[model samples]
Target: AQVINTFDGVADYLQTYHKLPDNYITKSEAQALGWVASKGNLADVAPGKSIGGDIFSNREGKLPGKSGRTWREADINYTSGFRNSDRILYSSDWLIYKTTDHYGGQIFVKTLTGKTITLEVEPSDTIENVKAKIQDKEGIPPDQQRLIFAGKQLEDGRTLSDYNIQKESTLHLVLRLRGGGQTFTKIR
Candidate 1:
């Protein structure tokens, strides 16, 4: 149902229909029809299907489990002319979950005190969330925390990836000064 891309979608398909849709074809079946991955010409051989017949290596180790756990994956549309890049993948016996874990990208925050802390962040994480982590680590309040990258200020609403921040990149932090300003008045 609804072009199974998410884990829930895959579950829904299995629950509603008691089986996965015919969108998925085994590797051998696809190969028998002269389907070569290099050519990406599945439509020519099968008319209305995408190849979902490969074993997922889980090489990144992003999924939860031992190193050897494998999964089955399928592309959503390889038929009827619309090329959507959505795909569904599932384990044979267990369900995998979405993770917030960033594989390697980390932002190094350097405070005015010269204390530096490396924080892991994802491209989907907002700058506000990053500031919260900084607060937790360095005791700096979100409003007082001024993050600068390459001489420009990082906005709270934008993501770290929006600033093109990558792993090992150093971000400078400046604290906003409170009070202690001169008051102008008539000489009295």
Candidate 2:
């Protein structure tokens, strides 16, 4: 079976075919059988095969899409539990496809207080993801900020490209009013 094992390439492959390649298995599926990750005792117990296809974490709310389209991770170049830092983002829906640490670099953000600051992001990072970094940088907390670009209000679920964000583009930031007997909107 031809398995696409490169992190640089797996996301592209997954996005193209919308499926995991032939040579991967779910982390729990592998563990339920013979895969072990303490130091990859795979060759000793399973013979000539390695463990891969681990699920990715999205607690930071950076990766987009839902469970049916959630991000997945596959381990590459395993040797004694050590491997390359690069990992691929996969999903059942083939929507969120990213590689770890291959960042979006610094963009300038202008605050309502008449100040601009630089922040970093990733390719296809969500508006919520931008809020999290803004939270970290300015102590504003998540969901407490309103971002605008090109005069359009940014919504939490959409990514940078939805607003045509490009490298070094400037964004406007304002504190969301918390007490107006009003609620905000979120997408599915």
Candidate 3:
């Protein structure tokens, strides 16, 4: 008697609309429905990304908090290596992501280990110029040098302008410790 009374109004709708029989409903069902109704589905779901979104999707290639501004990533020696130029690369933090080859024919840097060296980074030097310095000092050609940062290889032709290195910060140069590669071939 009490069960029939409880499923009075909405029971008909659940049975008719959801295709459940009247006998299918139980005391647990009523409690479950009440609980669900009481607690609305507000944050139980994950909001999806914008219709067509990516890391550089919105803001026309700029970031949200960094709109129309440049933040520090690392400090680089801009003008020391290669031709003894006064070029410098500067950033607020260390470029834990990008890398160069003071080591081998192939630029392979995983962690900040191996024969790590320091480039007396100049001021405001771009990655392009930096690579040229590496090539000149280490004798590794452009084709042979692979640049890595944050465990990812930077796209060729991307310069310090692409990244935000600060001024006067000595970048820790990590070279591969391979036994005999291109680096071994060139001593100076």
Candidate 4:
């Protein structure tokens, strides 16, 4: 079998081998196996393999996590004739995102422009967070967008779980128009 280097390759490997190959060894495991970086002769030990086993810093803050969630990884960086491209990410803890209506927590937001968006949120996430996400997607400012769920306005500071927001719950978004008037006038 050929060694893979893409993210999809990692998934394919997991599907095939059930676990990462010995070529991808954890740092501690490599250390225990007499592999030393200072010596720079890992070939003397494992032979024809690359060092992989490092912590993924998540510096870009792109991946989902709380304030200090840590992630570790195993990489396949070298072989006899391997070419470098994007590196595969391997981690012990996986994040499972909601994809369907049958499982997990997700809510549907419908805008006045008929734009619909599905938002993935945890039970502990506040309505303000959802508003921020909506703002990101539709360019509608959080304060100016009003979310109505089950005929009641969702409070910004309260958690979605507190309002019993469930899977597939539909929320209507009302945009506060440009003028600062309490009464809405009918436009002809």
* Total backbone collisions for each predicted model: 0, 0, 29, 0
Q: What residue runs in model 4 are displaced by over 4 Å at the alpha carbon?
A: 1-12, 15-104, 178-188
In model 2, the worst 10-residue window by lDDT is 76-85
Instruction: Please give the RMSD of candidate 2 to the true structure.
Output: 13.4
Whole-model lDDT per candidate: 0.63, 0.64, 0.31, 0.60
Looking at model 1, the pairs that clash are none
Per-residue lDDT of 59-152 in model 2, one digit per residue for the tens? Answer: 4666774655556666553333323345566665665454545434447899878989977565588987888878777787665678888889
Q: For every model shown, what is its TM-score relative to the native structure?
A: 0.42, 0.43, 0.27, 0.44
Descending-TM-score candidate ranking: 4, 2, 1, 3
Better of 2 and 3 by TM-score: 2
Angstrom error at residue 83, model 3? 24
Residue-wise C-alpha lDDT for candidate 3, range 87-181, written one tens digit per residue: 11112221112223211111222223454433433234456556666665556555555566544554534554354433322233444444343
lDDT of 3: 0.31
lDDT of 4 by residue, 73-146 (tens): 44444553322333444445544121112122346899988989876555676887788777776687775788
Q: Which residue pairs clash within candidate 4?
A: none
